[PDB]
C-alpha cells in the first residue's frame, strides 16, 4: 500500500480509503473495479527487494498511523507509529507466508521449526486433490472418504481453496495418559 | 479448481521449477581472503539481455 | 499441488539461511529438512 504525507486533512495517510474498499466489494458481490484498478489509480505499488532498501513500511495501517494525544493484558506486546516517514504500508503481514504455512493455525504460537515441519507434512496428507479424480488415470491416487473443512481456519485458506478441497477430519481429541499405548 | 501452470509431456504433468541465479551486469566488491596477493576485487557478471 | 507450482531451486556465501531480504518474497517456514534445507525456497 502507498502512504502519502499528501493529505491536507491531518497527517501522512494511506492512499487507499474506505471508499475504494466498498468499490472493490461491489465487484465481489457481482460474483468493474479490479486489482489493476488500484494499481493504475496508484494506491498500491510493486516493490522488489532492491527498491525495498529505500522505503519504510507500517505493519498495520490503523495501528501504525495516528499518534497519541487501560491496555488489554491478554494481547501480545506491540511497538508504535513513531515515524512520520512511512512511504508504504503492509497489506497483511500474514502474506510473508507461502501456500503450506498458510494452512497452519496460530503459527505465531509455535516454536519456529514445528511450523517448518507442518510445511512438509500437509504435502503428504490425503484429501480431495481435484474433483475430476474419478475421470483421470493417474499412477497412484488417494482420496479421503469423508473429508471435513477445518474448524480452526486461516483467513489465507479462502484463496487456497482449502475449505473446498480439505486434507483431514476434525477429530475429537483427548490429550491423556491412558493405557500407555 | 485445477490452476494450470504445468505442462503435459508424453502424458505426464510436468512443473518447471524456478531456478535461482545471481543477477547479471552487477558491480560487486568483495574482500579477498588473508592468504592472497589481491586484497579486494570488483566483479561484473556482464551478459546480453 | 499449489505449493509445488510455487517452488524454487538454488543450485551449488551462506545460502541456506533465511535472509532479511526474503521478507515478504519467500516463505520463512516452507523449506525441506535435509541436504535441500534452505536451498529449496517457497514463494
Amino acid at each position: 500500500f502507498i502512504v502519502e504525507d499528501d493529505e491536507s486533512l491531518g497527517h501522512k495517510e494511506l492512499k487507499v480509503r474506505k471508499g475504494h474498499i466498498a468499490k472493490l466489494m461491489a465487484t465481489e458481490y457481482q460474483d468493474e473495479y479490479t486489482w489493476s484498478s488500484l494499481l493504475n489509480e496508484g494506491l498500491v505499488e510493486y516493490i522488489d527487494a532492491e527498491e525495498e532498501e529505500s522505503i519504510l513500511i507500517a505493519m498495520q495501517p490503523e495501528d501504525l498511523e495516528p499518534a497519541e494525544a487501560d491496555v488489554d493484558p491478554a494481547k501480545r506486546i506491540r511497538v508504535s507509529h513513531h515515524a512520520t516517514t512511512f512511504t508504504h504500508c503492509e497489506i497483511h503481514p500474514s502474506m510473508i507466508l507461502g501456500v503450506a504455512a498458510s494452512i497452519i493455525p496460530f503459527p505465531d504460537h509455535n516454536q519456529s521449526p514445528r511450523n517448518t515441519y507442518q510445511s512438509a507434512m500437509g504435502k503428504q496428507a490425503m484429501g480431495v486433490f481435484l474433483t475430476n479424480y474419478n475421470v483421470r488415470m493417474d499412477t497412484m491416487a488417494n482420496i479421503l472418504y469423508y473429508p471435513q473443512k477445518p474448524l480452526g481456519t486461516t483467513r489465507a485458506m479462502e484463496y487456497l481453496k482449502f475449505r473446498e478441497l480439505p486434507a483431514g477430519q476434525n477429530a475429537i481429541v483427548a490429550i491423556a495418559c491412558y493405557s500407555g499405548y | 479448481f485445477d490452476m494450470g501452470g504445468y505442462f503435459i509431456i508424453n502424458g505426464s504433468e510436468k512443473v518447471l521449477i524456478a531456478q535461482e541465479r545471481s543477477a547479471g551486469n552487477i558491480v560487486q566488491v568483495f574482500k579477498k581472503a588473508a592468504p592472497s596477493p589481491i586484497s579486494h576485487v570488483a566483479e561484473i557478471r556482464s551478459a546480453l539481455e | 499441488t499449489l505449493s509445488h507450482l510455487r517452488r524454487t531451486n538454488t543450485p551449488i556465501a551462506k545460502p541456506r539461511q533465511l535472509h532479511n531480504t526474503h521478507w515478504g518474497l519467500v516463505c520463512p517456514a516452507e523449506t525441506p529438512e535435509g541436504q535441500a534445507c534452505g536451498l529449496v525456497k517457497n514463494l
Binding site: 474506505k18 474498499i21 472493490l24 465481489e28 488500484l38 495501517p61 490503523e62 497489506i91 484463496y159 | - | -
Partner: peptide, 30 residues
Amino acid sequence: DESAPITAEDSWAVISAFFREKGLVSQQLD
C-alpha cells in the same frame, strides 16, 4: 465519507481482489 481511513479487516478485501485477478500460479503463467 467515501474517503475515510482503512481498517484491519479492510486489507482482506484488497487481498481478495489480488487473487481474484492474479490467481495463485500468476508467476508460472505470465
